[PDB]
DNA sequence: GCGCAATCAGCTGTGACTACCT
DNA sequence: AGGTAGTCACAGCTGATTGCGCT
């Protein structure tokens, strides 16, 4: 059901590599990017499905 | 009441700890109380053997290049 | 032999549903030790549960 | 015999040593060999040009619904047509583009022949969601293009581009008579098909002097359009071709001055949307009409308004910069500081201009021959 | 030699760092070469090192090569002499050659041309310039069985004697142990005994400069020597073989791996050699286009080495084939030459030059060393990074995206260990969702997708769930061919599934997306071949593995060949927009239902 | 009734898991 | 106190059989 969908999503999308990555992001830069060069390099090195 | 150590981890490691409890791989059933799908309660007198087992599991499927 | 072997296991593997035994510990009466300590022993696997009751 | 069946090449034999440490100097030459990898020409092809009145004919039949190019032929065709219009107006200052759409055995002039880039792009974007019905009629589109381009001056190069998707055309009359009429009228017709080669298109392109091509994929489509972007070569001196055109100054209006008169743009008045009531814009030198876009021919007095920098951007082709004489540093008896960058001359070769006899390093010589296109010493 | 930090330090061994750093090279005492790529002399140093040593890793900045005896044999096979190579290595050392390499190089290069093997009148002979070496090897017990009947002196002219044809592999293995390696040189310019054919490639099939270098190194002094050329599948590999066959100008025999590779080679020959169909023959027991009396013959393995009863026509064809010399016997997919029955194939036919071609020279069981004497030395090793920098090879963006184990599956994974856990991490619901998301995304962006998946039992429910075409493998010949033929030129269908079938050189069309799930354990050859099916960021391929399982270790240990080739595997832990759309196994009900059907195997 | 294509038996390659002697 | 021939999975090949089609 609707509750089962939410439970499965919570179990899957955040099982191992989110319980620390999300916490680090909450304790991260937060503000704007360092330079525009970093953003361009990140966009170049990111996959097409990660830029949408 | 129960006194010990709360262990928080991913569900995969929680189930690995549960398997260790049921298989008696540590020699006893010291994994007593399960509270959540991602949290467990373990007696603190044998946290070392649990750490050794976790390290063995982790580096077993690692293929160190050393 | 092959055509009977390929179907003999179809009904064999369709019967069992639960493989893992239920591990729910059905502790019996509590045993009282010193310092208000209470121990519970599982009647299925012999698991011992020692706790302090307020 | 074969070239590779002889002796094996030893490319490492080039390097040599005489003082047990001279190898560095050799690689220095390699560094000097690293530079000057260009021909000192950003284009290196046609050094002149000629005005073009190009017509783009777009098929609107059911064959445009084919999904050979994602999502369908019509969408990719219109996207590449927008790109082609932008590039064509970038590389041609005083050219004109008209758009005709063929559909249901008829031809409709989607956009009149003009030099405005924004109008054509908007028309194409509107036409993206058109309905594809019927079959194309090359005869009607060619007749309309010939009728419009018949009265154009002879010095202008009259070109028609046909994007023929469907493999069949309905001709109300004989088309070879029309082809002969086009040949007598000196009209260049080029066709870029999408499915396969058609005999009539090949005959038309061969007789009218144009080029006929067939699309392999979207990349080949873009390559063909880019090839069509380049203007045709022109004679050294053909005729008395001159055109009266103005140069509107971009005068903005400020409330600090008392000459701030708000005015509606003449081009924006013709649109369905509310015309922009801006402070100011481009004023016609003849009738003081207000316009927001350039180059746009004036609707009132008929004068053409062209931006001077666009015309001046191609002047370096008329006066190419002569190559500087490469002179070794030892053989030059003079100052050892570069005239352009004031840097010390340490390279093995020093370039000296033939006019002002100034010394330029490798970097300054490359910069002058590639971008500046003018000798700084000769300017003074 | 010293182990202060556990690192072999050679600071005192090679101090010749005169002036000062201009030589982009470092030598090792035992043996190794480190090359600096960011040098003005990079191309010349690379050309020098390729001709003398084989690479061990080619990352973007610092290449590493290894010095081996066979590499030096290949170097001295070309016109390069000992003095030239020694003086040029000393020329670019920047540290000084240790006195353990010069002696090693001298010892390797001294005994190169002393012993030669020749084929004449369907007879194998071993000829030596120095008569003493014959008496040196006379006392060897293994060699004495080759001669029959004892070959008392075989007085000719230069001392030579006959050897047993079927025991040539044994003597080839023994000679290198005797420090007298054999050389396979075919001077096809002047034979006057072998009936050369009129093959001549059309002068329209141009070849890239690296192919020119490989061919030029093949024919160094007007003669052809047996060797191995390693080129990517997407790059031009069949063209090199066709050009070599045309240059040899003799009767050619081509060996493939599958029954469809022979058609591929026939098509390549008909395309780039201008050979009449009468001379071209294929011997694979399908049409039997009169292989008797032919110029070029194409066949496959597992047919020339049958140990069982053979067909009547095939028996006569083999009898005819084993009665004449062969020119430039070409082997395809040479990596799987060292097999139980494939090794004897070279001993069942007689040929002058044996040219092996492959894309993935890596293999387990350390049997690649045997290939050094089975065929010859590793001639050319193409640099994949510079190959893709020129734009002729698609720059594939490698990805290693893993998925967590679902709780309903990890308990069973840790519960069972007797080989029953393969299906558990093979059919991970999270991996299934990731694969479905990738399929949908790359179909929305219109990219051809090839999904490799071993363990076809899992692939069944993996493919029928999405209702997409798949190749079980034991289906038929027509169905697979038609599926692969309509996969390319059809916009409606642009994704296929392959189960270990595409792990060889096939005619699969161009694709941009490859997704591999649950492949073999540590088959670097298999992963390299799968990667080769994509290149021909134009393209990119993904590998899906399950965390906290043996598949993680397998993926880690199988990608080392590619990182040696210069590729980098980016790790993707989160998929953007995973929950944006609906995917299969959304709820836990079907996930736990999957356990019963995945444990329903019970293969006992 | 004959002829072509589908089908299986037997052997082999590749990679990995497992039970007794220096 | 530490390592290799059988065994299993999944593919390939060729050598026969073996039911299916008929202007
Ligand atoms: Zn005006
Ligand atoms: Zn300067
Ligand atoms: Zn000047």
């Amino acid at each position: 059901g609707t509750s089962s969908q939410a439970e499965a999503a919570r179990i899957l999308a955040a099982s191992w590599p989110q319980n620390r990555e999300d916490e680090e992001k909450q304790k991260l830069k937060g503000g704007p990017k360092k330079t525009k060069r970093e953003k361009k390099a990140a966009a170049s090195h990111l996959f097409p499905f990660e830029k949408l | 009441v129960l006194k010990g150590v709360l262990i928080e981890c991913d569900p995969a490691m929680k189930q690995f700890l549960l398997y260790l409890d049921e298989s008696n791989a540590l020699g006893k059933k010291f994994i007593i109380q399960d509270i959540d799908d991602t949290h467990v309660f373990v007696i603190a007198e044998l946290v070392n053997v649990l750490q050794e087992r976790v390290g063995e599991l982790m580096d077993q499927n690692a293929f160190s290049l050393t | 032999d092959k055509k009977v072997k390929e179907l003999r296991r179809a009904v064999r593997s369709s019967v069992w549903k639960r493989e893992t035994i239920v591990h729910q510990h059905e502790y019996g009466p509590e045993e009282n030790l010193e310092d208000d300590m209470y121990r519970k022993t599982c009647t299925m696997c012999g698991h011992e549960l020692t706790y302090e009751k307020m | 015999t074969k070239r590779w069946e002889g002796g094996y090449e030893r490319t490492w034999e080039i390097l040599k040593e005489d003082e047990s440490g001279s190898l560095k100097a050799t690689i220095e030459d390699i560094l000097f060999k690293a530079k000057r990898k260009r021909v000192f020409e950003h284009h290196g092809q046609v050094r002149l040009g000629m005005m073009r009145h190009l017509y783009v004919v777009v098929d609107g039949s059911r064959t445009m619904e084919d999904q050979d190019l994602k999502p369908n032929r019509l969408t990719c065709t219109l996207k590449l047509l927008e790109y082609f219009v932008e590039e064509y107006f970038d590389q041609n200052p005083i050219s004109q583009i008209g758009i005709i759409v063929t559909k249901s055995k008829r031809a409709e002039k989607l956009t009149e022949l003009s030099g405005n880039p924004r109008k054509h792009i908007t028309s194409l974007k509107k036409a993206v969601d058109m309905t594809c019905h019927g079959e194309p009629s090359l005869y009607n589109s060619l007749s309309i293009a010939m009728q419009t381009l018949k009265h154009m001056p002879g010095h202008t190069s009259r070109e028609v581009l046909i994007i023929f998707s469907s493999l069949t055309t309905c001709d109300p009359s004989n088309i070879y008579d029309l082809i002969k009429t086009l040949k007598a009228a000196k009209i260049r017709v080029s066709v870029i098909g999408l499915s396969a080669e058609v005999r009539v298109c090949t005959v038309l392109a061969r007789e009218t002097g144009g080029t006929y091509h067939v699309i392999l994929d979207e990349s080949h489509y873009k390559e063909l359009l880019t090839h069509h972007v380049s203007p045709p070569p022109a004679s050294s001196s053909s005729e008395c071709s001159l055109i009266r055109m103005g140069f509107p100054q971009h005068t903005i209006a400020s409330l600090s001055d008392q000459d701030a008169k708000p005015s509606f743009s003449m081009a924006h008045l013709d649109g369905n949307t509310e015309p922009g009531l801006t402070l100011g814009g481009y004023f016609c030198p003849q009738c003081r009409a207000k316009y927001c876009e350039l180059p746009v021919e004036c609707k009132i007095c008929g004068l053409t308004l062209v931006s001077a920098p666009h015309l001046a951007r191609s002047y370096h082709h008329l006066f190419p910069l002569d190559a500087f004489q490469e002179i070794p540093l030892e053989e030059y008896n003079g100052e050892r500081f570069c005239y352009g960058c004031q840097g010390e001359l340490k390279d093995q070769h020093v370039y000296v201009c033939a006019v002002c006899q100034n010394v330029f390093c490798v970097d300054c010589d490359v910069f002058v021959h590639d971008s500046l296109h003018c000798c700084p010493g000769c300017i003074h | 030699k010293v182990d202060e930090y556990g690192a072999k330090d050679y600071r005192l061994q090679m101090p010749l760092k005169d002036d000062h750093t201009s030589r982009p090279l470092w030598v090792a005492p035992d043996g190794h070469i480190f090359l600096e790529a960011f040098s003005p002399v990079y191309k010349y140093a690379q050309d020098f090192l390729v001709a003398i040593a084989e690479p061990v890793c080619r990352p973007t900045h610092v290449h590493e090569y290894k010095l081996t005896a066979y590499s030096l044999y290949a170097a001295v096979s070309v016109g390069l002499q000992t003095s030239d190579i020694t003086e040029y290595l000393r020329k670019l050392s920047k540290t000084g050659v240790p006195d353990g390499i010069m002696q090693f190089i001298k010892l390797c290069t001294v005994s190169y041309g002393k012993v030669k093997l020749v084929l004449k009148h369907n007879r194998y002979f071993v000829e030596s310039c120095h008569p003493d070496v014959i008496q040196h090897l006379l006392q060897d017990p293994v060699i004495r069985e080759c001669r029959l009947r004892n070959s008392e002196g075989e007085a000719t002219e230069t001392v030579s004697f006959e050897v047993k044809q079927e025991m040539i592999e044994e003597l080839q293995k023994r000679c290198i142990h005797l420090e007298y390696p054999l050389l396979a040189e075919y001077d096809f310019r002047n034979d006057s005994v072998n009936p050369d054919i009129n093959i001549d490639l059309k002068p329209t099939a141009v070849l890239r400069p690296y192919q020119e270098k490989s061919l030029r190194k093949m024919f160094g002094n007007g003669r052809a020597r047996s060797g191995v050329i390693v080129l990517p599948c997407g790059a031009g590999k069949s063209l090199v073989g066709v050009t070599a066959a045309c240059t040899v100008r003799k009767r050619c025999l081509v060996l493939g791996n599958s029954a469809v590779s022979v058609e591929q080679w026939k098509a390549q020959f008909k395309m780039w050699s201008t050979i009449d169909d009468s001379q071209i023959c294929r011997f694979t027991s399908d049409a039997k286009d009169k292989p008797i009396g032919c110029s070029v013959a194409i066949s496959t393995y597992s047919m020339l080495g049958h140990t069982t009863k053979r067909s009547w026509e095939a028996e006569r064809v083999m009898e005819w084939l084993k009665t004449q010399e062969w020119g430039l016997m070409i082997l395809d997919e040479v990596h799987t030459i060292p097999a139980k029955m494939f090794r004897r194939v070279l001993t069942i036919v007689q040929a002058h030059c044996k040219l092996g071609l492959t894309a993935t020279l890596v293999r387990e069981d350390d049997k690649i060393v045997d290939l050094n004497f089975l065929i010859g030395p590793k001639l050319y090793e193409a640099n994949w990074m510079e190959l893709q920098n020129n734009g002729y090879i698609a720059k594939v963006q490698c990805a290693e995206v893993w998925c967590p184990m679902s709780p309903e599956f990890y308990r069973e994974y840790v519960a069972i260990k007797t080989k029953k856990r393969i299906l558990l991490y093979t059919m991970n619901p999270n991996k299934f969702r990731a694969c479905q998301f990738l399929i949908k995304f790359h179909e929305r962006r219109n990219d051809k997708i090839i999904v490799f998946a071993d363990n076809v039992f899992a692939l069944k429910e993996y493919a029928i769930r999405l209702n997409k075409p798949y190749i079980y493998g034991p289906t038929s010949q027509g169905e697979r061919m038609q599926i692969l033929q309509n996969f390319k030129h059809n916009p409606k269908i642009n994704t296929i599934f392959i189960s270990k079938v595409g792990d060889t050189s096939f005619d699969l069309p161009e694709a941009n997306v490859l997704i591999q799930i649950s492949s073999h354990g540590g088959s670097r050859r298999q992963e390299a071949q799968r990667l080769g099916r994509v290149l021909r960021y134009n393209a990119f391929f993904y590998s899906l593995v399950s965390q906290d399982t043996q598949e993680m270790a397998y993926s880690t240990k199988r990608q080392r060949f590619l990182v040696d080739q210069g590729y980098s595997f980016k790790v993707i832990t989160k998929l953007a927009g995973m929950e944006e759309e609906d995917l299969a196994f959304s709820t836990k009900e079907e996930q736990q239902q999957l356990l019963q059907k995945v444990l329903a195997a019970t293969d006992l």
Side-chain angles (χ1 to χ4, degrees), chain E residues 2 6 20 41 57 71 91 94 190 193 207 227 260 329 341 348 365 396 464 545-546 548 564 592 599:
Chain E
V2 195
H20 182 272
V41 74
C57 77
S71 58
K91 186 71 62 60
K94 104 183 299 178
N190 40 11
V193 179
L207 22 67
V260 77
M329 200 269 291
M341 72 165 296
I348 211 176
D365 309 329
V396 44
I464 68 179
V545 293
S546 303
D548 305 333
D564 290 1
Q592 65 183 0
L599 269 69

Coordinates of all heavy atoms in Angstrom, one line a residue, chain E residues 2 6 20 41 57 71 91 94 190 193 207 227 260 329 341 348 365 396 464 545-546 548 564 592 599:
Chain E
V2 N 66.9 -3.1 0.4 CA 66.6 -2.7 1.8 C 65.1 -2.5 2.0 O 64.4 -2.2 1.1 CB 67.4 -1.4 2.1 CG1 67.5 -1.2 3.7 CG2 68.8 -1.4 1.5
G6 N 59.5 -1.3 3.8 CA 58.9 -2.4 3.0 C 59.0 -2.1 1.5 O 58.4 -2.9 0.8
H20 N 70.1 16.9 -16.3 CA 69.9 16.8 -14.9 C 68.6 16.0 -14.7 O 68.5 15.1 -13.9 CB 69.7 18.2 -14.3 CG 69.5 18.1 -12.8 ND1 68.2 18.0 -12.2 CD2 70.3 18.1 -11.7 CE1 68.3 18.0 -10.9 NE2 69.6 18.1 -10.6
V41 N 59.9 14.6 -25.7 CA 60.4 13.5 -26.4 C 59.5 12.2 -26.1 O 60.0 11.1 -26.3 CB 61.9 13.2 -26.1 CG1 62.1 12.7 -24.7 CG2 62.5 12.4 -27.2
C57 N 51.5 -1.0 -17.5 CA 50.4 -0.1 -17.2 C 50.6 1.2 -18.0 O 51.7 1.7 -18.1 CB 50.2 0.1 -15.7 SG 51.3 1.3 -15.0
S71 N 60.6 -10.0 -24.7 CA 60.6 -8.7 -25.3 C 62.0 -8.4 -25.9 O 62.0 -7.8 -27.0 CB 60.3 -7.7 -24.2 OG 61.3 -7.8 -23.1
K91 N 71.3 6.5 -23.1 CA 71.0 7.9 -23.5 C 69.9 8.5 -22.7 O 69.9 9.7 -22.3 CB 70.8 7.9 -25.0 CG 70.6 9.3 -25.6 CD 72.0 10.0 -25.6 CE 73.0 9.3 -26.5 NZ 72.5 9.3 -27.9
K94 N 68.6 9.0 -17.1 CA 68.5 10.1 -16.1 C 68.9 9.6 -14.7 O 69.1 10.3 -13.7 CB 67.0 10.6 -16.0 CG 66.2 10.1 -14.8 CD 64.8 10.6 -14.8 CE 64.8 12.2 -14.8 NZ 63.4 12.7 -14.9
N190 N 61.7 -15.0 -51.7 CA 62.4 -15.9 -52.6 C 62.1 -17.3 -52.0 O 62.8 -17.8 -51.1 CB 63.8 -15.6 -52.7 CG 64.5 -15.2 -51.4 OD1 63.9 -15.3 -50.4 ND2 65.7 -14.7 -51.5
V193 N 59.4 -22.6 -54.5 CA 59.0 -24.0 -54.2 C 57.5 -23.9 -53.9 O 56.8 -24.9 -54.2 CB 59.8 -24.6 -53.1 CG1 59.4 -26.0 -52.8 CG2 61.3 -24.6 -53.5
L207 N 44.6 2.4 -43.9 CA 44.8 1.9 -42.6 C 45.5 3.0 -41.7 O 46.2 3.9 -42.2 CB 45.7 0.7 -42.6 CG 46.6 0.4 -43.8 CD1 47.7 1.5 -43.9 CD2 47.2 -1.0 -43.7
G227 N 54.1 -13.8 -34.6 CA 53.9 -12.8 -33.5 C 52.4 -12.7 -33.2 O 51.6 -13.3 -33.8
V260 N 30.2 -18.4 -36.6 CA 29.9 -17.2 -37.2 C 31.1 -16.3 -37.5 O 31.0 -15.4 -38.4 CB 28.8 -16.4 -36.4 CG1 29.4 -15.7 -35.3 CG2 28.0 -15.4 -37.3
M329 N 49.5 -18.7 -41.3 CA 48.3 -19.2 -40.6 C 47.9 -18.2 -39.5 O 48.6 -17.9 -38.6 CB 48.7 -20.5 -39.9 CG 47.5 -21.4 -39.5 SD 46.9 -21.1 -37.9 CE 48.3 -21.8 -36.9
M341 N 43.0 -29.0 -26.1 CA 43.0 -29.4 -27.5 C 43.3 -28.3 -28.5 O 43.6 -28.7 -29.6 CB 41.5 -29.9 -27.8 CG 40.5 -28.8 -27.9 SD 39.0 -29.3 -28.7 CE 39.6 -29.6 -30.4
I348 N 49.0 -29.9 -35.6 CA 48.3 -30.8 -36.6 C 48.3 -30.2 -38.0 O 48.0 -30.9 -38.9 CB 46.8 -31.0 -36.2 CG1 46.4 -32.4 -36.6 CG2 45.9 -29.9 -36.7 CD1 45.0 -32.7 -36.2
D365 N 45.1 -18.9 -15.1 CA 45.9 -20.1 -15.1 C 47.3 -19.8 -15.6 O 48.0 -20.8 -15.9 CB 45.2 -21.2 -16.0 CG 43.8 -21.4 -15.7 OD1 43.4 -21.3 -14.5 OD2 43.0 -21.8 -16.6
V396 N 34.7 5.7 -23.8 CA 33.7 5.1 -22.9 C 33.9 5.6 -21.5 O 35.0 5.5 -21.0 CB 33.7 3.6 -23.0 CG1 35.1 3.0 -23.0 CG2 32.8 3.0 -21.9
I464 N 12.0 -11.3 -19.1 CA 10.6 -11.4 -19.3 C 9.8 -10.4 -18.5 O 8.7 -10.0 -18.8 CB 10.0 -12.8 -19.1 CG1 10.1 -13.2 -17.6 CG2 10.8 -13.8 -19.9 CD1 9.6 -14.6 -17.3
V545 N 26.7 -4.2 -9.2 CA 27.1 -5.2 -8.2 C 26.4 -4.9 -6.9 O 25.8 -3.9 -6.7 CB 28.7 -5.2 -7.9 CG1 29.4 -5.6 -9.2 CG2 29.1 -3.8 -7.5
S546 N 26.3 -6.0 -6.1 CA 25.6 -5.9 -4.8 C 26.6 -5.8 -3.7 O 27.5 -6.5 -3.6 CB 24.8 -7.2 -4.7 OG 23.9 -7.4 -5.7
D548 N 28.4 -5.7 0.0 CA 28.6 -6.7 1.1 C 28.4 -8.1 0.6 O 28.0 -9.0 1.3 CB 27.6 -6.5 2.2 CG 27.8 -5.0 2.8 OD1 28.8 -4.4 2.6 OD2 26.8 -4.5 3.3
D564 N 44.8 -0.9 -15.8 CA 46.1 -0.9 -16.4 C 46.1 -0.4 -17.8 O 47.0 0.3 -18.3 CB 46.6 -2.4 -16.5 CG 47.0 -2.9 -15.1 OD1 46.8 -2.2 -14.1 OD2 47.4 -4.1 -15.0
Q592 N 9.5 -10.0 -1.1 CA 9.5 -11.2 -0.3 C 9.0 -12.4 -1.1 O 9.3 -13.5 -0.8 CB 8.8 -11.0 1.0 CG 7.3 -10.7 0.9 CD 6.7 -10.4 2.2 OE1 7.3 -10.4 3.3 NE2 5.4 -10.2 2.2
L599 N 14.6 -19.3 -4.4 CA 15.1 -20.5 -3.7 C 14.4 -21.7 -4.2 O 14.7 -22.8 -3.8 CB 14.7 -20.3 -2.2 CG 15.8 -19.8 -1.3 CD1 16.0 -18.3 -1.6 CD2 15.5 -20.0 0.2

